[PDB]
Amino acid sequence: QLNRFVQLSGRPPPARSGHRCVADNTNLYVFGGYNPDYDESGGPDNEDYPLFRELWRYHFATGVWHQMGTDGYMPRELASMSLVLHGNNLLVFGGTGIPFGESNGNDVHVCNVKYKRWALLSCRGKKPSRIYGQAMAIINGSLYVFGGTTGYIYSTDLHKLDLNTREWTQLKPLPEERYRHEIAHDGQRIYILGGGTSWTAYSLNKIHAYNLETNAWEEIATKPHEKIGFPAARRCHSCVQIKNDVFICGGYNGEVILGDIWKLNLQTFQWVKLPATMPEPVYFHCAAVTPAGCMYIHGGVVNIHENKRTGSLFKIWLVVPSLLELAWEKLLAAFPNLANLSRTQLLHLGLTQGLIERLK
Amino acid sequence: DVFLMIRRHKTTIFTDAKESSTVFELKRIVEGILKRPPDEQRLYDGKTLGECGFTSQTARPQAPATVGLAFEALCIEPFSSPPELPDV
Amino acid sequence: MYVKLISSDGHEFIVKREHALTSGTIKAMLNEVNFREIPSHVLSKVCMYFTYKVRYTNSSTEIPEFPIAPEIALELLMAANFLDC
Amino acid sequence: LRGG
C-alpha cells in the first residue's frame, strides 16, 4: 500500500492550473498558475488575476506550504511556461500571459532558491520565437527546447543553448507539430511523449526520438502491455523520469480526462500500467519527482464541462524506497515534535548535517 | 513463497522457500549453509510447509516467522533490547 | 554463495550475497563482515529490508509498507545512513 | 489554444 496515491494537507495555496513544479530532496517548488474564478483566486487581493504570480514551496518534512518572498523581476509568463531544476537553481523559459498568445516569452530566467533571487540570462544567438507549451531538457550541461505553439502557428524546432558560453543555436536535422508534449532523455537520444494540437491528441504507441550523435530523427514502436494495450492518446499530461524509466500521468484527449499512470522503460520500450488510479483525475496539472523516488502532483482541472480546478496535492511512491527514506518517514510520523528542536539538540541526538538540513 | 529466519543460539539464517517445499528441503539447504547433515538436526520432518502453518500471508519478506533449529534443546538468544530516550 | 555478518553483541546473520549487495557499503567492503556498532535489533531489520527490497524491486503489483517500530527508528536510520541502503 |  505504498505505491498508491495519498492526499496531503496542512495555508495551502488556492486552486490553480497550467502551473509547473519541480522537486528536490527537501522541498517541492511550484511556479505559475492560472485560475479564472474570482472568489477562488483570492478575490481582489490577487492583483495578477487570473494569473498566479506566486512561487510556492511544500516542505516534505513538516508538511507546510510557504510562499517565497523572492526579489528581482518575476517573469510575467505564468501559464504553460517551462521550468527545470539545475543544481540549486530554477531555470524558467517560455510561457504566455493572459489572454493566451497575446504576450509569450522566449528568454531564460534563473531563480536561486538558496539565495531566493531572480535574474535573466544574457544568452546570445538565434533564440526560439516566443512560444508556450514547449518542452525543455538539460543534457550534458546544455538546454534543449522543442515544440510549443506561437499562438496561431505551431513549431517543431529543436533549439539548443550552451550554458557554459550561453550561446543559442537551432538544430537542423519529421514529427508532427505539437504543443504541451513531454520530453524524455537518456544522454544519447531525446524521446517525445504525448502532446497534440487543439483538435487532436497524438498516440503514444509510436515515439519520435532525436539522436544527438547522428543528428536525425527516428521512430520507435513501443511494445504494449500483456492484456491492457497501449496508453490512450493524451495531451496536457505530466511526465517524470527515474533512471531509464519514464512515468506519464494524467492528461486528456479533448473529451475525456484520463486518471491513469503508465511507465515506459527506455531500453526495452515496454509499457507497464501501474495499478493506481487517481482519487480525482485531472489534466493541465503539474507533477514532479524527488531524488528519493517519490512523485508529487498538484493543481489541474477536475471537470471538463464545468471548468472546475483543484488545489489537492497527492504523493505516490514509484520505486521501492531506500531504508534511509523509510526510516526518515517513520521517524517523522512517530515524533512530530522533532521539528521544534534546534540543530544542536538534533546533533546531540545524532542526526547528520544533511538530515537536519532536510528536517529544519 | 514464504520467507524464513532459521534461529539457533546467536545464529540466524535468512532464506526463502515455496509452500510446496518440504522440511527435508529446508534441512538440506541449511546443511548447505552451515555444513550439518539433516539427520543430525531438527526444527520446530517430511510434511511440506503447506500444512506446517507457514502461510504466505504471515511469512511476508518484511516479517518472516522464526523456526527453532536444534542439533539438545532449543536455545534462541533474543536480540538486543532497544533503549529508552526522552522525546526532547 | 552466502555472506556472513556479525552484530555488535555477537549475533550472527547469514544472508544471500545478492541481497547483501543492495547496500553500497557492504559491496565496497567486499566471507565475513564484522559490525562493531550496529546492534542485533537493527542488523536484523537491515537484513529484513535487504530481502524485502530485493524481492519487491521492479514489481508491477502493490508494494506493502515496511513495518518499523518507533523505538528502533533512530538507530535504524543511523544504520541505513552508514550502510548506504 | 488554452495555456491553462
Author numbering:
A (entry chain A): 41 to 50, 87 to 249, 256 to 442
B (entry chain B): 2 to 45, 53 to 79, 86 to 102
C (entry chain C): 17 to 46, 58 to 112
D (entry chain D): 73 to 76
The authors write:
The largest cohort of CRL SRs recognizing terminal degrons are the four BC-box proteins in the KLHDC-family (hereafter collectively referred to as KLHDCX), KLHDC1, KLHDC2, KLHDC3, and KLHDC1031,32. These SRs all feature Kelch-type 6-bladed β-propellers that recognize C-degrons bearing terminal Gly residues. Members of the KLHDCX family employ Kelch-type 6-bladed β-propellers to bind substrates, and a BC-box binding EloB/C that serve as bridges to a cullin (CUL2 or CUL5). Importantly, we discovered that these E3s share a defining C-terminal carboxylate-anchoring element (R/F-S-R) establishing them as C-degron E3s.
Although ARIH1 is not the preferred ubiquitin-carrying enzyme for this reaction, we were able to obtain a cryo-EM structure at 3.33 Å resolution for the overall complex, and ~5.5 Å resolution over KLHDC10’s propeller, representing ubiquitin transfer from the active site of neddylated CRL2KLHDC10-activated ARIH1 to Lys48 on an acceptor ubiquitin recruited by KLHDC10 within the complex. The overall conformation of the ubiquitylation complex is similar to analogous complexes reported previously, and thus we focus here on substrate binding by KLHDC10. Visualization of details of the substrate binding site was achieved by focused refinement using a mask over the ubiquitin-KLHDC10-EloB/C region, resulting in a map at 3.19 Å. Most strikingly, the C-terminal Gly adopts yet another unique orientation in KLHDC10: instead of facing blade 4 (KLHDC2) or 5 (KLHDC3) of the Kelch-type β-propeller, here it faces blade 6. The C-degron binding pocket within KLHDC10 is relatively smaller than in KLHDC2 or KLHDC3 (~15 Å long by ~8 Å wide), but maintains the organization of two chambers separated by a ridge. Unexpectedly, KLHDC10 employs a variant motif - FSR (Phe366, Ser93, Arg391) - in blade 6 to engage the substrate’s C-terminal carboxyl group. The substrate’s carboxyl forms an anion-pi stacking interaction with KLHDC10’s Phe366 in lieu of contacts with the first Arg from the RSR motif observed in KLHDC2 and KLHDC3. On the other hand, KLHDC10’s Ser93 side-chain hydroxyl and Arg391 make interactions resembling those from the RSR motifs in KLHDC2 and KLHDC3. The C-terminal di-Gly sequence is further anchored by KLHDC10’s Ala155 from below and flanked by two aromatic residues, Tyr110 and Phe176, on one side opposite of Phe366. KLHDC10’s ability to recognize Ala tail substrates might be explained by a constellation of hydrophobic residues consisting of Leu127, Ala155, Try110, and Phe176 that from a small hydrophobic pocket adjacent to the Cα of Gly76, leaving just enough space to accommodate an Ala sidechain.
